[PDB]
Write a protein that binds this ligand. Structure first.
Ligand SMILES: Nc1n[nH]c(C(F)(F)F)c1Br
Ligand SMILES: [Zn+2]
Length: 198
C-alpha cells in the first residue's frame, strides 16, 4: 500500500558510499558486517556503526537519511515498522517515535519523519566532518526489533537505504545493505557465509 523508494546505488557528485568496521564473528560480537552478503548482522538495539565516505566534501547543510524496506518483491510495498509488542514497550527516547525501527544513537539533532504520503519512517541527521583523528564520519544506528518479531518483520529480510541529501531533501547519493537483527550475529554471519560458499 505504499510507493517503493529506490534502492539503486548512486555515488553522485561527491562519490558517496558506505563503509563498515571489521568486527569479526565471535559469539560475543554485537554487530558484524558481511561484505560477501552485503549484510549487517546485529543484536537488538545495540550500536551499529556505519561509515560515510566521500571523494569530496559536500556543502554545509547536507544530511544523511536511513530508511528500511522489505527486500522481497511481495513485501516491498509494506511499511517496515516495529512489531505490536515493541511499539508498546515504552522504550522511546523522546525523539524516536515508538513505531520506528531505526534510531540514531547519541545525536540530539536526529529528526524522525513519518512521510505524509507514503507513511514510511526514516531518521535523518546533519552531516558533520570527521572527528579529529579519523578519515570518515560515522553514524551509530540502532535497530529496535528482531527480524523474527511476530506481527512486525516476521522473519522477512529488510534492506536499509542510506541517502545523502541536500538541505531541501534532494538526493545527492544512495547506498544500501541488508540487515538481520538477531540474538547471535557472529554465529549467523558464519552460517550464512558458509551457506553461500556451498
Ligand atoms: N567533511 C566531511 N567529510 N565527510 C562528510 C560526510 F559526512 F558528508 F560524509 C563531511 Br560533511
Ligand atoms: Zn519487535
Amino acid at each position: 500500500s505504499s510507493s517503493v523508494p529506490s534502492q539503486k546505488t548512486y555515488q553522485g557528485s561527491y562519490g558517496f558510499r558506505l563503509g563498515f568496521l571489521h568486527s569479526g564473528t565471535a559469539k560475543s560480537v554485537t554487530c558484524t558486517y558481511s561484505p560477501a552478503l552485503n549484510k549487517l548482522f546485529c543484536q537488538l538495539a545495540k550500536t551499529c556503526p556505519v561509515q560515510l565516505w566521500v571523494d569530496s566534501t559536500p556543502p554545509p547543510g547536507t544530511r544523511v537519511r536511513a530508511m528500511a524496506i522489505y527486500k522481497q518483491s511481495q513485501h516491498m510495498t509494506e511499511v517496515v515498522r516495529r512489531c505490536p509488542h515493541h511499539e508498546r514497550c515504552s522504550d522511546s527516547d523522546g525523539l524516536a517515535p515508538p513505531q520506528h525501527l531505526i534510531r540514531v544513537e547519541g545525536n540530539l539533532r536526529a529528526e524522525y519523519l513519518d512521510d505524509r504520503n507514503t507513511f514510511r519512517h526514516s531518521v535523518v541527521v546533519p552531516c558533520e566532518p570527521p572527528e579529529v583523528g579519523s578519515d570518515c564520519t560515522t553514524i551509530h544506528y540502532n535497530y529496535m526489533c528482531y527480524s523474527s518479531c511476530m506481527g512486525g518483520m516476521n522473519r522477512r529480510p529488510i534492506l536499509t537505504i542510506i541517502t545523502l541529501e541536500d538541505s531541501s531533501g534532494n538526493l545527492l547519493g544512495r547506498d544500501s545493505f541488508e540487515v538481520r537483527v538477531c540474538a547471535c550475529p557472529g554465529r549467523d554471519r558464519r552460517t550464512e557465509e558458509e551457506n553461500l560458499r556451498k
